[PDB]
RNA sequence: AACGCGUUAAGCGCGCCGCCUGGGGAGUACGGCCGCAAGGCUGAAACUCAAAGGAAUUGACGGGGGCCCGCACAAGCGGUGGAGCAUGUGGUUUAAUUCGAAGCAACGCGAAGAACCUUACCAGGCCUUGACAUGCUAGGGAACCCGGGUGAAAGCCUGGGGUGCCCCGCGAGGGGAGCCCUAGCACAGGUGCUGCAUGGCCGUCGUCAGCUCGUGCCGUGAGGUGUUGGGUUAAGUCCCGCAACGAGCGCAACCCCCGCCGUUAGUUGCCAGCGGUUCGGCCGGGCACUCUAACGGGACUGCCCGCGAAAGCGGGAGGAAGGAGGGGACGACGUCUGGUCAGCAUGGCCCUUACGGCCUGGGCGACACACGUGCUACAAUGCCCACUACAAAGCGAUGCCACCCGGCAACGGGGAGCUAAUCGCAAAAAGGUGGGCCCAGUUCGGAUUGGGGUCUGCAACCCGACCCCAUGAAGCCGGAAUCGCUAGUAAUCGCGGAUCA
């Protein structure tokens, strides 16, 4: 029925915009169309490294695409094979000067949108879903944190009765503002249904 | 008539009166904003993720 | 078995009697004995069932009890239910009047814009690897640009400009990377059915004060304690108690708007003070006011009096403001096989010269009727005309339009400022003032139909909005019923915005 997106509830504090610039009221329209089909193309051809963020900064014609990953290798190649073809590909729709980067996540178990995709892959390859969850939570809190939570939707085991599986440890005050709690969500896609996974990480405070 | 239509929206046949709006993500026909090019849902989904610069949770 | 029993045993033992062996049929029939009778004792069977039953959990419920809440009632003010009209639905109708939503929690709801578009529906004309994707084969054609005919359009038939390359190269010419005409194959497409196959998102109980975990202790076990009890709070808020001691999702707190004051900044503000003013903060001058938007201070039951073990309750001062200061955003474990396959996503099912696709016309706007949400009213605390004041939040380049000129006006010819605290929408309206109506179906009320016009649009017959003359219908305050709101609230008055010709 209810429970709102924990990102939208922070924006003003804590979480910052995953696309920050300014633009006019003939141009937001257009600069926005761009920003999706960008993040759309990247989502595909780059899944392999686990793009847990896709920032975009800007001033005028100068794009600051920064991709954040825990396994940086896959994006470059050794020296520069892959990174080459992408620069080409990006500006292949945008006749503007495409300035692409990469950044590192010290611990991927503390990046939710990852934790979510990990468990969604585990389900697509038929593993015990009660376990996979109770386990992925230890993974996170094990590697230092204050709290963490996961939620898998309906058609567990491919049963005609769709349920909803839970489990989570520590503290997760989604109602509190001075919080900082990373959220991500993944789609498992099977022969019988379409599951849904939600991941929550409690990190700092004050 | 869902696919055939979103494609009819792009072209501008006879008499410019016919040229209707249409959401970008959602093939949405109703509830479509000039400023964003988007539907009411399409929008609200985004706004929560930050993919729309400076569009913040209101409160007055 | 548990509830309980416990020298008045249901404990441990011995003696003798009576009795039970699944439920219905049935304490019935037959026979027998008894009885004045009513009936009594003794007492079956066929046929049929998957259980019938005892104690104890945890809930739910009560025309049970106790403590306590909420515009729940009560106190009070304004409404619907009646008329006329606008809009949503039932029904009948129809070639079709597309589908969904169904007590509260469907019905001015998806719909924040249906004349063709939309558009999913019907009638009529057409098109098949298709309006869109990915890849292969083959001669032409390899980009592209302008017309002809036919038709209602879609479509189908059909006349002319002719190619900047990797590169044999003076040249004939020729390999060829884009991209498109055409055949043909792999495939596209379906708002076709399944919201009890599903994700995500939303409604609701309910902003209610709750819902739980770990260990220990108790029970053969379901399960219990904790979380029952006394005080106190908006609150599982806090105190105090206690075989429990802690901890989590909740509430509160951190985040935004209104209130008071400071610091920073001066093309909005200011004779606040002298200055010139065609008297317009117009002008030079000037940030002290006002405002604008950015960083702060301020309130913590901290001070005093009383009540109390404590938490905290009542009362007083200072204060712009106290005891959550006024509004927001935020809604627990779960409930309704709740809602949505028609926003999208998605398993399965079904159609692949059509259940796909294109257009032209219709339909969604039908009307003997029925219900919901609304608008304008029936008038004097009123209606009409002239003149005259005081807002806020927003919005604007083939956009908002100053100011002119014409028209009774709708509007229409000119045309300055504007990327907008520097120009524009723009007058707020109720109010104030003075002139008219004099209790009437009326100078109240504006439905209906005739006549005449304007503007958007290719096009206003079915179906648009405005303006002018004339027509001026029903309504004299509404049966049974039934809604809202506790303060800048109800009532009443006008302004803006999304969608958008």
């Amino acid at each position: 029925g209810n429970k709102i997106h924990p990102i939208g509830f922070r924006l003003g504090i804590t979480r910052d915009w995953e696309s920050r610039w300014y633009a006019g009221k003939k141009q937001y329209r257009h600069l926005l169309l761009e920003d999706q089909r960008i993040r759309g193309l990247l989502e595909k051809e780059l899944y392999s490294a686990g793009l847990a963020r896709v920032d975009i900064e800007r001033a005028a014609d100068n794009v600051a695409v920064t991709v954040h990953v825990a396994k940086p290798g896959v994006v470059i190649g050794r020296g520069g094979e892959r990174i080459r073809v992408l620069r080409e590909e990006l500006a292949k729709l945008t006749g503007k000067n495409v300035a692409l980067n990469v950044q590192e996540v010290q611990n991927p178990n503390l990046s939710a949108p990852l934790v979510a995709q990990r468990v969604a892959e585990q389900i697509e390859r038929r593993f015990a879903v009660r376990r996979a969850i109770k386990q992925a939570v230890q993974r996170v809190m094990e590697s230092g944190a204050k709290g963490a939570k996961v939620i898998v939707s309906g058609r567990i085991g491919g049963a005609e009765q769709a349920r909803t599986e839970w489990a989570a440890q520590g503290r997760v005050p989604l109602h509190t503002l001075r919080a900082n709690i990373d959220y991500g969500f993944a789609l498992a896609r099977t022969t019988y249904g379409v599951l849904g996974v939600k991941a929550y990480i409690f990190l700092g405070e004050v | 008539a869902r696919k055939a239509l979103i494609e009819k929206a792009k072209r501008t046949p006879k008499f410019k009166v016919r040229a209707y709006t249409r959401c970008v993500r959602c093939g949405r026909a109703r509830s479509v904003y000039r400023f964003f090019g988007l539907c009411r849902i399409c929008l609200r989904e985004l706004a929560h993720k930050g993919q729309l610069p400076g569009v913040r949770k209101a409160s007055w």
Side-chain angles (χ1 to χ4, degrees):
Chain A
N2 50 331
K3 312 138 193 283
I4 89 304
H5 211 125
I7 303 319
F9 191 64
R10 293 321 185 293
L11 294 179
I13 170 170
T14 294
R15 191 71 69 271
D16 276 48
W17 282 255
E18 202 182 312
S19 211
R20 56 194 221 174
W21 26 283
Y22 160 112
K25 57 221 161 80
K26 274 111 36 62
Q27 307 298 326
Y28 209 122
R29 162 89 165 178
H30 280 300
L31 285 180
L32 187 57
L33 210 191
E34 203 170 277
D35 269 16
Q36 244 65 12
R37 50 173 67 148
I38 288 167
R39 282 199 200 76
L41 231 338
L42 278 157
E43 231 87 323
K44 307 182 192 70
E45 298 162 40
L46 184 51
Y47 176 38
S48 315
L51 62 176
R53 216 189 178 287
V54 195
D55 197 51
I56 302 196
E57 297 211 338
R58 280 199 289 213
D61 293 59
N62 62 290
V63 191
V65 181
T66 314
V67 181
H68 298 229
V69 197
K71 188 182 173 195
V74 189
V75 307
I76 319 157
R78 66 132 162 70
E81 299 87 4
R82 176 62 147 158
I83 192 173
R84 217 85 199 182
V85 293
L86 298 171
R87 295 151 174 169
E88 227 84 39
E89 284 284 76
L90 289 177
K92 204 66 64 56
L93 43 70
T94 313
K96 293 172 180 179
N97 209 330
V98 288
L100 189 177
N101 316 319
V102 192
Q103 246 270 317
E104 194 175 274
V105 184
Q106 251 51 41
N107 199 313
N109 302 337
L110 300 164
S111 174
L114 305 182
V115 191
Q117 293 155 301
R118 196 219 175 74
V119 174
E121 287 194 90
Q122 278 181 87
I123 294 162
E124 281 153 312
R125 315 148 173 166
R126 281 63 139 278
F127 284 121
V129 189
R130 187 100 274 280
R131 197 216 293 138
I133 290 175
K134 188 72 205 289
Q135 190 181 74
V137 159
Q138 190 62 66
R139 205 186 326 290
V140 172
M141 295 292 283
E142 197 156 38
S143 84
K146 282 163 159 191
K149 175 173 287 171
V150 203
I151 280 153
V152 180
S153 88
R155 288 224 81 164
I156 298 177
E160 259 190 54
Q161 199 57 60
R163 300 180 277 120
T164 172
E165 218 79 60
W166 194 53
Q169 229 162 144
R171 293 211 318 166
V172 175
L174 309 100
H175 271 307
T176 309
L177 277 319
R178 57 193 271 288
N180 183 31
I181 309 183
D182 201 14
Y183 167 99
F185 151 83
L187 291 297
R189 332 176 52 199
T190 85
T191 332
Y192 45 74
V194 192
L195 275 289
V197 199
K198 295 181 179 178
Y200 303 83
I201 328 260
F202 189 50
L203 292 153
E205 205 182 293
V206 199
Chain B
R2 184 188 57 151
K3 198 66 60 179
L5 290 181
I6 59 164
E7 298 303 311
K8 187 186 291 181
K10 318 206 172 192
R11 302 181 282 91
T12 313
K14 281 163 149 277
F15 325 128
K16 61 152 189 171
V17 291
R18 295 206 206 183
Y20 52 88
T21 56
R22 186 73 84 169
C23 161
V24 161
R25 298 179 63 185
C26 37
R28 203 62 149 73
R30 294 189 142 83
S31 195
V32 266
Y33 288 81
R34 325 216 78 120
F35 185 96
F36 287 106
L38 299 185
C39 92
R40 75 135 183 278
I41 326 297
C42 319
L43 152 35
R44 196 167 83 100
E45 280 148 9
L46 297 175
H48 293 307
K49 291 187 167 170
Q51 294 202 26
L52 301 165
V55 176
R56 179 174 148 159
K57 262 296 213 165
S59 194
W60 67 94

